[PDB]
Amino acid sequence: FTSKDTYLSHFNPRDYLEKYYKFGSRHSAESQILKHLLKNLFKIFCLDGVKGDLLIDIGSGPTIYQLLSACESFKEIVVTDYSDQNLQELEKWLKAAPAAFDWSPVVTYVCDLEGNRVKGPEKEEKLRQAVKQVLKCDVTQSQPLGAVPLPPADCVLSTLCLDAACPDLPTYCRALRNLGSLLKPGGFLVIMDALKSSYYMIGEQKFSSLPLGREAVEAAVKEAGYTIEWFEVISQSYSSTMANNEGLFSLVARKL
Ligand SMILES: Nc1ncnc2c1ncn2[C@@H]1O[C@H](CSCC[C@H](N)C(=O)O)[C@@H](O)[C@H]1O
Ligand SMILES: CN1Cc2cc(F)cc3c2N(CC3)C1=N
Numbered sequence: 001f002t003s004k005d006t007y008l009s010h011f012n013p014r015d016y017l018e019k020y021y022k023f024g025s026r027h028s029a030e031s032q033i034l035k036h037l038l039k040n041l042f043k044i045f046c047l048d049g050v051k052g053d054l055l056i057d058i059g060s061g062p063t064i065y066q067l068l069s070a071c072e073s074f075k076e077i078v079v080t081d082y083s084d085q086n087l088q089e090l091e092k093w094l095k096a097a098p099a100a101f102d103w104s105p106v107v108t109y110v111c112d113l114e115g116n117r118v119k120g121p122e123k124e125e126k127l128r129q130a131v132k133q134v135l136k137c138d139v140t141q142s143q144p145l146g147a148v149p150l151p152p153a154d155c156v157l158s159t160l161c162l163d164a165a166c167p168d169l170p171t172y173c174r175a176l177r178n179l180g181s182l183l184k185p186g187g188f189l190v191i192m193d194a195l196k197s198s199y200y201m202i203g204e205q206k207f208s209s210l211p212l213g214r215e216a217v218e219a220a221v222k223e224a225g226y227t228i229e230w231f232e233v234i235s236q237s238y239s240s241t242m243a244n245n246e247g248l249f250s251l252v253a254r255k256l
Helices: 004-010 013-020 029-047 084-094 104-113 120-130 169-180 214-223
Strands: 052-058 074-081 131-136 153-159 183-195 199-202 205-208 226-234 247-255
Touching: 004 205, 013 029, 013 084, 013 199, 029 104, 029 183, 029 247, 074 084, 074 120, 074 153, 084 131, 104 120, 120 131, 153 169, 169 183, 169 214, 183 214, 214 226, 214 247
Parallel strands: 052 074, 052 153, 074 131, 153 183
Antiparallel strands: 183 247, 199 205, 226 247
16 A cells, blocks of 8 residues: 555645646546535535534645635634645645646636635635644544644545545544544534545556445444434546546534
8 A cells, every 4th residue: 555655755746736636628537526526515515504613624635626615614724634745735825826726717616506606716715714724634643633732623524535545444444533533522524535446646656545335434434433414426437547446425424
């Protein structure tokens, strides 16, 4: 399995954003999946009653797409990744660096799902002010943020991280409990990840992915102290040149 040092030495954040998050008129498997993720995260943070004071995002990578509907429903967003270089990319955007990744196609798509109430500029300034803390993170540790003081959060979010981060089910189920340590009892857990998948590519470079099915996922979340409110499985896959998944699951859970 890809080790944490392989993420520190070889995970290229600029390449990663270019292969997966360049929203494209040409209807790429990647654009479709991104459109799938974007309409689910709107559904969860805007239509459903998923709102709170504090949202922690775990495995943020170099991406801000998972936070664009979230910032409508939370006052404070803390973003985390195990890879510093990833957190360095994220911050470029937060600072509105003119060398930050261009997200606006995505910001336009979301500004649309939310019924054009706001322009691109002012949905971007909602997210920037919402993100209060950018922190090192590790889902294998029982205190994944280490020493860092944080109030109990109302929602933990993890997009396409825990498949990347966990060599096996025991580790996977351990990681779920550990994110619960950051959550108020009856606090929301949101996970969007790949189903039946062993790898994904960032350019020439190969990264493992925990190969796990519908049953295994939903079993681990119960084990970890959660009750599932909704669970969803789309059959849409990544390009065959990039990933070997059979689909993607989304879930909203609660902490017993
Ligand atoms: N043990 C670990 N703890 C925390 N993050 C980890 C980890 N192992 C890998 N990661 C991070 O998990 C991420 C997987 S890529 C996911 C990026 C983004 N959330 C998206 O949905 O596209 C990488 O940024 C990698 O650095
Ligand atoms: C963007 N993707 C693509 C992808 C496809 C896949 F099948 C499995 C995994 C990924 N990962 C994590 C695990 C990502 N971070």
